[model samples]
Target: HMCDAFVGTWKLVSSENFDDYMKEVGVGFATRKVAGMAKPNMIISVNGDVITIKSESTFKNTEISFILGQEFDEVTADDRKVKSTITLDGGVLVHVQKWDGKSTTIKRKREDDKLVVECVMKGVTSTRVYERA
Candidate 1:
């Protein structure tokens, strides 16, 4: 199944410009410092049409579950409430979050045993690479 590609545990390997991207999203400097220092691990699970994405880190842990193409309310790690949706586009999982007239896009794709995530908001873009763990 196509969902099989997304179901696994991924450990953060490399992140580029993530702090700047977080800053663009209104993350406070102290939280960004904690977020920057922590390595996040993602655990993805797929059950029928529902997908759960869990992020674990030393600073904080959060999990979000949503059905494909359905919008749901989510509280971001930065403690902002947003409407979120996830969809698959050509084997890549594309997630969109909108709140207070602001929007962010995140694309997650599997490349070999690595999960590559691209986050974009307010013209700033960051890439976080993860390896199967």
Candidate 2:
């Protein structure tokens, strides 16, 4: 279920700050400042147990590739921690990053006609709905 929904090149239209969400996850002010200003573009390609989420911007770029449900040491798309994991929860793709034993999870899904994606961090949440451009 997670594999099917995550396979594609998703162009990011916009992202609502999970509201100082990364700050809660210990994201640096400098990086968070830049992240807040830029629209993040994500590309995910999943084959079997392997998945990669590539985040691109004019200032910086990073990719996180790992097996389903297995934790790996790497950077994340939403700009959080180094160790992370991705999984399926109730038909939606659940991605989580752990730093200093604290973790933040993001929920991702496809709405068929539109690209429906979201992020949830503590009390702050962000949702982005995109159409083909």
Count of steric clashes across candidates, in order: 0, 0
Q: Over 4 Å off in model 1, which ranges?
A: none
Per-prediction TM-score to the true structure, in the order listed: 0.97, 0.79
For model 2, the stretches where C-alpha displacement exceeds 4 angstroms are 77-81, 130-133
Best by lDDT: 1
Per-residue lDDT over 1-133 for candidate 1, one digit per residue giving the tens place of the 0 to 100 score: 6579879999999999999999999999999998898899999998877889999999889999988899999998889899999999999999999999999999998897789999999789999999988
- Give the C-alpha lDDT of model 2: 0.70
lDDT of 1: 0.93
Error of 2 at 84 (Å): 1.2
User: In model 2, what is the error at residue 4, expressed in angstroms?
Assistant: 2.6
